[PDB]
């Protein structure tokens, strides 16, 4: 913690910058040693296709893991969300 | 178990009969006392909208809980799936 809060901040921020993300609805992050393992849910446009939602999830996973190096496991899922 | 396997059978079967379900991809079911609590993932058409996928999930939840009375908690989520 404290230092976790700073990491979580960077995860939320990294995710929100990815096209199609309507907020991070949920983020659970934990230290396994010096590595982070995490799970998040993002908001998506309810009219996107399931495919697009899966694409946005992958894109988040890559942007986030691309920016926070200590992350060794991130699962990203999606939920319909209004703006 | 044994009797769990019979319940799980009925959950899979109930789910597959619901329009838009492309198989049950995952089912975790457990006894809390004499009640079942469960979580499942269904296949959906990747071109459905996220909204439709959420609708199909609710419809599964209701059909299944409507048919297996001992179920007191069922969460249903969806994943893109090819036929």
Numbering used by the authors:
A (entry chain A), B (entry chain A): 211 to 293
From the reporting publication:
One group of metal ion efflux transporters that regulates metal ion homeostasis and can be found in all domains of life is the Cation Diffusion Facilitator (CDF) protein family. One of the most highly conserved and abundant integral MM proteins is the CDF transporter MamM. MamM was recently proposed to function as a magnetosome-directed iron transporter required for iron biomineralization since its deletion abolished magnetite biomineralization and mutation of residues within the conserved TMD metal-binding site resulted in alterations of magnetite crystal size, morphology and even mineral phase. To summarize our results we present an alternative model for the CDF CTD mode of action, in which we propose that upon metal cation binding, the CTD induces conformational changes towards a tighter and more compact fold which allows the activation of iron transport through the TMD.
To test this hypothesis, we combined the D249A point mutation at the central binding site and the H264A mutation at peripheral sites. Although no cation binding was detected for the resulting double mutant, D249A + H264A, by ITC in vitro it still produced magnetite particles in vivo. However, magnetite formation was severely affected in the D249A+H264A mutant as a significant non-additive decrease of the magnetic response, the average particle numbers and the average crystal sizes were observed. In addition the D249A+H264A double mutant showed a drastically delayed formation of magnetite during iron induction experiments. These results suggest that proper sensory and regulatory activity of the CTD can be achieved through a single type of binding site, either the central or the two peripheral sites, to allow proper activation and transport of MamM TMD. Therefore, the reduced magnetite formation reflects decreased MamM activities caused by less (e.g. MamM D249A) and/or shorter (e.g. MamM D249A+H264A) TMD activation events. To confirm that these observed phenotypic differences are due to true transport function alternations, we also examined the expression levels of all MamM mutants, their ability to stabilize MamB expression, performed MD simulations for dimer stability evaluation and determined their CTD structures. (ii) All mutants exhibited an apo-MamM CTD-like behavior along the MD simulations, and (iii) an absence of structural differences was observed.
